[PDB]
Amino acid sequence: IKKPNNNKILVPKVSGLQYRVFRIHLPDPNKFGFPDTSFYNPDTQRLVWA
Amino acid sequence: MSLWLPSEATVYLPPVPVSKVVSTDEYVARTNIYYHAGTSRLLAVGHPYFPIKKPNNNKILVPKVSGLQYRVFRIHLPDPNKFGFPDTSFYNPDTQRLVWACVGVEVGRGQPLGVGISGHPLLNKLDDTENASAYAANAGVDNRECISMDYKQTQLCLIGCKPPIGEHWGKGSPCTNVAVNPGDCPPLELINTVIQDGDMVDTGFGAMDFTTLQANKSEVPLDICTSICKYPDYIKMVSEPYGDSLFFYLRREQMFVRHLFNRAGAVGENVPDDLYIKGSGSTANLASSNYFPTPSGSMVTSDAQIFNKPYWLQRAQGHNNGICWGNQLFVTVVDTTRSTNMSLCAAISTSETTYKNTNFKEYLRHGEEYDLQFIFQLCKITLTADVMTYIHSMNSTILEDWNFGLQPPPGGTLEDTYRFVTSQAIACQKHTPPAPKEDPLKKYTFWEVNLKEKFSADLDQFPLGRKFLLQAGLKAKPKF
Amino acid sequence: EQMFVRHLFNRAGAVGENVPDDLYIKGSGSTANLASSNYFPTPSGSMVTS
């Protein structure tokens, strides 16, 4: 639903037949401050989420 | 890196130690004392669509009783700290407190299976757009018709020690940036409310407020024409930190689109110019593109029945493992599979031997039948300082219902007491205060069930009692 | 026991309990008189199988 003069959407299209493709953003686990960080070397290893 | 640059970047630090929510298996100790409680038989007769009330008064002569309502029972258990046991030497009342736990539940239903039909005498319907022969003729004024529909089929049963929470779409207030014209679309908002006994279930038209969102008053059938159709908030009830509002639930739902209709009225938002090619002559004006289906819960079957079966609560979904805090339980029941509406009639004159329509007054009625049975275990909590803090933070009124707290009685510094309390220059010195309200659940309506006098210790004399004994091994009667 | 609703019908006869006036909006002309709000479905026990 957009105005006849402009094209700014006043009410978007939301139906039960659209793909809902979510893009999940995770925190960088190499930027986690672990109390015992000695569990992973930053000069030879890197972390990732599974 | 070959350069020494000034500062650093994000570091997600470990959070501060929080006092976590723990399972009731850690501070609530179970005992071998089980009790059977059950209601006599719960009947409710009324009108399926509206409450018949006096034309001049407002006393309700016949209440509204539909198969599409929420049955929220508020069970009352006897206080195990006041209960009379044959031997009270299993717990020490100086450092312990007792509470009932729910072990098994049987929600018995009584009437035969059947599907009831509801409809509006003036329903906002323009045409049947499922299979049209020619383009619609002139849409005049007041094109409403009398249409009926059988609703979506639904069964559910939520058990907890707090009242359930339902969701629906309501009317919010638009931000103060819009030039609001009359006849504008109401902005939507999802609202959470405590489901009370007598609220209408979602029926295939959405969980919405049909009073504030449809001023037409003619788009849904008579029973939900001015009601609020509510759907249980499972996302919110299972995500509550303590798990009190829901520690067991079932649900069965089914619906298909039976007929496909149109709406009548001024167009709110017209079809944009790039979604069609304009017509000429008959199709020069677009028909109403506001479609709506009539729901249909299909065959009701005896095998898809979730009621009349015992549920043994061994591991609750949340942290509250079936502990009925406050000596109180909440059984929510929807069952639209026994919603047959019996149609009665009465003869104005018993003389006439020829049928005349003006001789018989036709009424509709509906009857419900419930019979609730629970098996309750007896649990004791040894209230240390840590358990007392945990419980006072979980629910404030538990430690005040049960005589425990040792909190200061007066908690006061100084009170004023004018001499010559009868003078005229003392500014109304009456130290005589009234009393306020006490129960926070007074604003809601539940089907109150008083199981205070209904607790029994010999289970094998009750159907659910011997079902429990059978499922748990042991017999009970080494007699004869 | 199994059953579904095959046909949705109406009942004829003087209305015993009239629809409250706050449940609808009055009509004019053809719809000035309410149709019968007494509905009754036609049952149908579905397929029988061995």
The 3-state secondary structure of C1-50 reads CEEEEEEEEECCCEECCCCCHHHCCCCCHHHHCCCCCCEEEEEECCCCCC
Distance between the two ends of chain A, CA-based, in angstroms? 41
Residue with tokens 């001015």: B226
Helix (H, G, I), strand (E, B) or coil at B114: strand
CA torsion, points B80, B81, B85, B91, in degrees to nearest 10?
110
CA distance B160 to B73: 11
- Provide the number of structural domains found in chain B: 1
Would B316 be classed as within a structural domain? Answer: yes
Which residues of chain B are at the A interface, by a Cβ-Cβ cutoff of 8 Å? Answer: 9-14, 269, 272
List chains adjacent to chain A, taking adjacency as at least 3 C-beta pairs closer than 8 Å.
Answer: B
Tokens for B189?
């908002």
Is residue B423 domain-resident? no
What's the distance, CA B174 to chain centroid? 29
Q: CB C23 to CB B115 under 8 A? A: no
C20 and B53 within 8 Å at the Cβ level: the answer is yes
Tell me if there are at least 3 CB pairs under 8 Å linking chains A and B.
yes
Tokens 């303590």 belong to B242
Would residue B32 count as lying in a domain? yes
Smallest CA-to-CA distance from B333 within B38, B69, B71, B75 is with B71
Run of H or E residues at B3: none
Which residues in C lie closer than 8 A to residue B302 (C-beta atoms)?
Answer: 1-2
Query: Residue B226's domain spans which residues?
Result: 28-412+436-472
CA nearest to B222, candidates C36, C29, A21: C36
Provide, as residue numbers in chain B, all residues whose Cβ is less than 8 Å from the Cβ of C24.
120-122, 217-218, 222, 225
- Searching chain B, which residue's CA lies closest to the CA of residue C47? B299
Domain contains B18: no
Q: Is B223 a domain residue?
A: yes
Q: Which chains border C (3 or more CB–CB pairs < 8 Å)?
A: B
For residue B445 the two structure tokens come to: 């309506």
Q: Is residue B399 part of a domain?
A: yes
Q: Token pair 């004994």 is at which residue?
A: B469
Let me know if residue B170 belongs to a domain: yes
Nearest to A1 among B10, B12, B269 (CB): B269
- To the nearest whole angstrom, how far is the Cα of B20 from the nearest Cα of chain A? 20
- Other C-beta atoms closer than 10 Å to the C-beta of B410 total 6
Those residues of chain C whose CB sits closer than 8 Å to some CB in chain B are 1-5, 8, 10-17, 19-20, 22-25, 27-31, 34-41, 43, 46
Rounded to whole angstroms, how far apart are CA atoms B161 and B418? Answer: 48
Find, among B23, B28, B30, B25, the residue nearest to B90 by Cα.
B30
Q: Is B473 left (phi over 0), alpha (psi -120 to 50) or beta?
A: left
Domain membership flag for residue B1: no
Sign of CA dihedral A14, A19, A20, A22: negative
Do A and C touch (≥3 CB pairs < 8 Å)?
Answer: no
The approach used to solve this structure was cryo-EM
Residues of A engaging B, defined by a Cβ cutoff of 8 Å: 1-2, 11, 27-28, 31-35
Q: How far is it, in rounded angstroms, from Cα B366 to Cα B341?
A: 5
Complete edge-to-edge strand list for the sheet that includes strand C39-44: B300-301, C2-10, C39-44
The answer to whether B196 and B211 have CB atoms below 8 angstroms apart is: no
The domain that holds B452 is classified in CATH as: 2.60.175.20
| Phi/psi-derived region of residue B60, left when phi > 0, alpha when psi is between -120 and 50, beta in every other case | beta
B228 Cβ contact partners less than 8 Å away, ≥ 6 residues apart? B168, B193, B199, B200, B208, B209, B210, B211
Structure tokens at A44: 């030879």
Q: Which of B8, B11, B12 to mutate to test the interface with A (most CBs of A within 10 A)?
A: B12
Count the neighbouring beta carbons within 10 Å of the beta carbon of residue B476.
Answer: 12
Q: Which of B376, B352, B345, B385 is nearest to B456 (CA)?
A: B376
| C37 alpha carbon, distance to own chain's centre | 5
Q: Do the beta carbons of residue B79 and residue B327 sit within 8 Å?
A: yes
